[PDB]
Amino acid sequence: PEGPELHLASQFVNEACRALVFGGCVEKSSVSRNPEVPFESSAYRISASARGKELRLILSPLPGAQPQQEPLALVFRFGMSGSFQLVPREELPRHAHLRFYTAPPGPRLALCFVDIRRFGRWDLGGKWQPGRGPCVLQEYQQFRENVLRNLADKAFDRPICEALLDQRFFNGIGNYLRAEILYRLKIPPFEKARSVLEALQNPDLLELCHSVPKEVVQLGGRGYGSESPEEDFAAFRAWLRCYGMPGMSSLQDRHGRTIWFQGDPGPLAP
DNA sequence: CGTCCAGTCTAC
DNA sequence: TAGACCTGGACGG
């Protein structure tokens, strides 16, 4: 998942938990190498916000809750397969590595961090990853300024397709967005990043870094819609113009990740 | 049955 | 920079 999936995951947590009350401990699977969450409360509400490719949960005990406890924040990174689900308490999915449990009265549910491949991570601080840049979706102007003031960075020496995955400058862009973004402007992927960016200093590359992900968010779905996984998966394939599509070229960047593009590979190509 | 394919993080 | 971390689905024999 990329910035749009993290954003939709946070909206899912806010809408699904709006009328729920959690109680008890936060339970971690025995196979997860992530930290135990030291939190217990007889009555707490869960809420969420996204920033780039990170999501922050806030656990908020109600007035009167026991034990006495301040709100607790956790920050998640989803890696390749992270997600959130709200399921019946006895119908936990196979890779539910972190679990929050509704309290009575009402149907006993669990909000679960589900992560098949366990590349995802959580941290006890409620702090965003030091060094990640501002959110291309929610901090557009900060995102733009942070790129254009730092074009000197050796990061922008690299091909534009590699620069676009550097989460210090493009927090929330991943493999499918970089393909989709470059294709809208027909910018060869192995053009030099500083060349393409010096040139701004008819939307431009940094505008699309915001507006293209924003399209996926408006689309909805990505496992957080009411509609089926069949309907979701199709809606998304239909939106895609470049990533994975018939008629499109693909190469490996310096990190063995696949870039999709039409036409000129660009000067710095393998 | 087998190979191959799909975001960080860290040891060299 | 390679290799490491993981599981599962698609496809080949």
Author numbering: 2 to 202, 222 to 290
Q: Can you quote the paper on this entry?
A:
Human endonuclease VIII-like 1 (hNEIL1) is a bifunctional DNA glycosylase of the Fpg/Nei family, which catalyzes the removal of damaged bases and subsequent incision of the newly generated abasic sites. Unlike traditional enzymes which are commonly referred to as highly specific biocatalysts, one special feature for hNEIL1 is its unique capability to recognize a wide range of substrates, including formamidopyrimidines, hydantoin lesions, oxidized, and dihydro-modified pyrimidine bases, derived from all four canonical bases. Here, by integrating structural, computational, and biochemical investigations, we show that hNEIL1 uses a triage mechanism to achieve broad specificity and reduce futile repair of normal bases. This mechanism involves two mutually competing interaction states: an activated state that commits catalysis and BER, and a quarantine state that temporarily separates and prevents the flipped base from catalysis via auto-inhibition.
We synthesized a 2′-fluoro-substituted stable mimic of DHU (FDHU), which allows binding but not catalysis by hNEIL1. In light of the observation that different hNEIL1–DNA interaction modes are largely resulted from the conformation changes of the lesion recognition loop, we chose to modify the potential key amino acids on this loop. In order to destabilize the quarantine state, we rationally designed hNEIL1(R242, G249P) and hNEIL1(R242, Y244H) to disrupt the flexibility of the loop or the aromatic stacking interactions respectively. Instead of the quarantine state originally observed in hNEIL1(R242)–FDHU structure, we found that both two mutants switched to the activated state as expected. Our study reveals that instead of utilizing a specific pocket to tightly recognize a flipped base via extensive electrostatic and hydrogen bonding interactions, hNEIL1 uses two competing interaction states to achieve substrate recognition. This mechanism is further corroborated by our finding that the relative dominance of the competing interaction states can be manipulated by artificially introduced or naturally existing mutations to the key lesion recognition loop.
